[PDB]
C-alpha cells in the first residue's frame, strides 16, 4: 500500500 | 546528508515557539521528516511527519498542540501553539525511513518551558 | 491509542553473552513491516540497527539480528561487546499515519 513515508 | 534543529532554548508557558529543522544532502520532495522528542531521561515520542507528498501527520496527543509545515525546500517547522510546563524535552527533526537503512537524525535542540 | 510496549524494562548481560528485546504492538505495522529497531546512548540522537523487521542496516555488525511476525518482533544481540551498553527502542509506523516508539529497554554491559 503506497505511503508517504519509507 | 545530514539534518539540524534551531531555534530550542528557554520559552515562557504560553508563548508560541517555533523549531526549525534543516536539511543538506537530503531530498525533501521524495522523502518525509519527522518531528519526535525525548524529555529527560525519558524515552523517544513520535510527535509528527510531513510526508513526501504534503501530507501531516499527527500523534492523536499531539493535535492541535502543534503544528508542522514546511517552510522551503530543505526546512520545515514545528510550532508549539501554547507549550505548557510537561512540553520541556530535547526535540530532534529525523529522516527516519522504517523499511531502509537512509536514516540521519539532527543533534537535538532542547527546549525548556519555564517563566 | 497506538501501544508498543516493550520488554524488559532493562536487563544486564556479560561480554560475549546474549540479550533478546520484545516489542509487542497493538495492531500489525504498516505494509506488515514498518519497523526499525534503534540504539542510544547518553547526548545523542539513536542509531539505526534494524530495518524492515530483520534487514541489517549498512555498517552494523551481524550479531544483531531482528525477527517478528507482524505485531510482535524480537532484537536478538549476540557476542555482546563493551560498546552494546546503551538503550534499545523499536519504532513502527501503521496504517492510520501514526508512528510510535517502545517504552526502550537499557542494557548494562556486566564485567
Known amino acids: 500500500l503506497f505511503f508517504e513515508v519509507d | 546528508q545530514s539534518v539540524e534543529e534551531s531555534g530550542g532554548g528557554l520559552v515562557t508557558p504560553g508563548t508560541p515557539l517555533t523549531l526549525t529543522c534543516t536539511v543538506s544532502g537530503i531530498d525533501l520532495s521524495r522523502y518525509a521528516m519527522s518531528w519526535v522528542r525525548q524529555a529527560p531521561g525519558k524515552g523517544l515520542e513520535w510527535i509528527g511527519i510531513?510526508?513526501?507528498?504534503?501530507?501531516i501527520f499527527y500523534a492523536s496527543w499531539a493535535k492541535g498542540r502543534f503544528t508542522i509545515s514546511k517552510t522551503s525546500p530543505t526546512t520545515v517547522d514545528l510550532k508549539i501553539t501554547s507549550p505548557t510546563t510537561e512540553d520541556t524535552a530535547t526535540y530532534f527533526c529525523?529522516?527516519?525511513?522504517?523499511?531502509?537503512?537512509?536514516?540521519?537524525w539532527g543533534p537535538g535542540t532542547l527546549v525548556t518551558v519555564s517563566s | 491509542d497506538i501501544v508498543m510496549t516493550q520488554t524488559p524494562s532493562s536487563t544486564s548481560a556479560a561480554v560475549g553473552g546474549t540479550v533478546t528485546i520484545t516489542c509487542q504492538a497493538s495492531?500489525?505495522?504498516?505494509?506488515?513491516?514498518?519497523l526499525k529497531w534503534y540504539q542510544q546512548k547518553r547526548g545523542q540522537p539513536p542509531k539505526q540497527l534494524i530495518y524492515?523487521?530483520?534487514t541489517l542496516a549498512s555498517g552494523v555488525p551481524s550479531r544483531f539480528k531482528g525477527s517478528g511476525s507482524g505485531t510482535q518482533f524480537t532484537l536478538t544481540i549476540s557476542d555482546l561487546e563493551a560498546d552494546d551498553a546503551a538503550t534499545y527502542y523499536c519504532?513502527?509506523?501503521?496504517?492510520?499515519?501514526?508512528?510510535?516508539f517502545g517504552g526502550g529497554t537499557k542494557l548494562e554491559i556486566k564485567r
Open positions: 529525523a529522516r527516519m525511513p522504517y523499511t531502509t537503512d537512509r536514516d540521519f
Open positions: 495492531q500489525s505495522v504498516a505494509n506488515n513491516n514498518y
Open positions: 519504532s513502527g509506523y501503521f496504517n492510520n499515519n501514526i508512528g510510535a
Open positions: 524492515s523487521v530483520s
Open positions: 510531513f510526508g513526501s507528498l504534503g501530507g
